[PDB]
Copies of this chain bind each other. A is one copy, B any other.
Amino acid sequence: PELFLQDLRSLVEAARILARLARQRGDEHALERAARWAEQAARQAEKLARQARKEGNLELALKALQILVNAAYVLAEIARDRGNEELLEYAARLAEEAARQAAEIWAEAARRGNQQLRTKAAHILLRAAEVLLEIARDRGNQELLEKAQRIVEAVAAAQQVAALALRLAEELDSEEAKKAVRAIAEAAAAALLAALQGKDEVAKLALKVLKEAIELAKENRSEEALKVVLEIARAAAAAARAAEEGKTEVAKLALKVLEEAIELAKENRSEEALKVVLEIARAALAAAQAAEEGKSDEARDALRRLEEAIEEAKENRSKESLEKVREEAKEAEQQAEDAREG
């Protein structure tokens, strides 16, 4: 049970001893035996985590990482002394595919409404990226450092999106607010998986778009703006499925489609201009399912339609032309219905 979880922690703390003890004894017979006391151990937890994540059980699969994550820092002191990069590039795959399912845990954290666990996942991601640090604290994998500095940057700022949620479910103890906050966070977890892939600038600017969402939500908070930011929360969310589809050319385009809209929020802040912005986003949630489908020449065919219209409200913002970008926003929202139907 959970006794076998504490029955495995000592085995890990038995490799950190026998590996440091057998490297200091010339016992490469026991240093290869202590290097086996860690390889024979970490797998029994990876199958335990795969079966716990299969049962939809969080708190145990969460405690299954902090023990399995530390298993790298012991195999680091082993494969560094023996010098075998075939046993060092083995802990590389042991940490990359480990933090793999660590973010799929932080998904249903906000996607199901657990807020004290979406901040408990950051420990693993923080204390597991530190397994590549001391692995290259002096060594040097130049391309690997270009990830942890773009990964650890994608954790601390990711948990920062969960900060305004609390300070807005506490500054606004409402259900029309704690539903957006739980979904404007269920939409912020995608920025993790969007900068955790090669495109680090795609999601650096993805959360940067959701940044102005709360700033335009604390400035003008309507019951039609709580749903304007919420219909834009889970709308810019799928801009990662466009970046996670080669279409970072269309995702960094799609994620930017809302930037000038959230900028046109507190300038011409009208209940008729909000419902034109609050109705302008829904196509992005359909154009992202189209760049997660493959129509980059049809998403950009519909994306190049709201550009001269982005140069419409920008050029012509007066009451009859921002309300003409209203009958033009409805026309732009029709290109998605002509594309979603396909």
Contact = CB atoms under 8 A, between A and B. Distances in A.
Interface string A149-166: 100110110010011001
Nearest to A6: B119
Interface residues of A, number: 45
Give this chain's copy count: 3
Nearest to A44: B163
- A interface: dominant SS: helix
A84 interface: no
Interface in A29-50: 30, 33, 37
Contacts of A219: none
Contacts of A18: 149, 152-153, 156
B3 A166 contact: yes
Interface in A139-184: 145, 148-149, 152-153, 155-156, 159, 162-163, 166
A11 interface: yes
B133 A17 contact: yes
Contact of A10 (B21, B25, B37, B119): B119
Contacts of A10: 119, 122-123, 126, 155-156, 159
A14 B155 contact: yes
A55 to B, nearest CB: 17
A115 B155 CA distance: 39
A96 interface: no
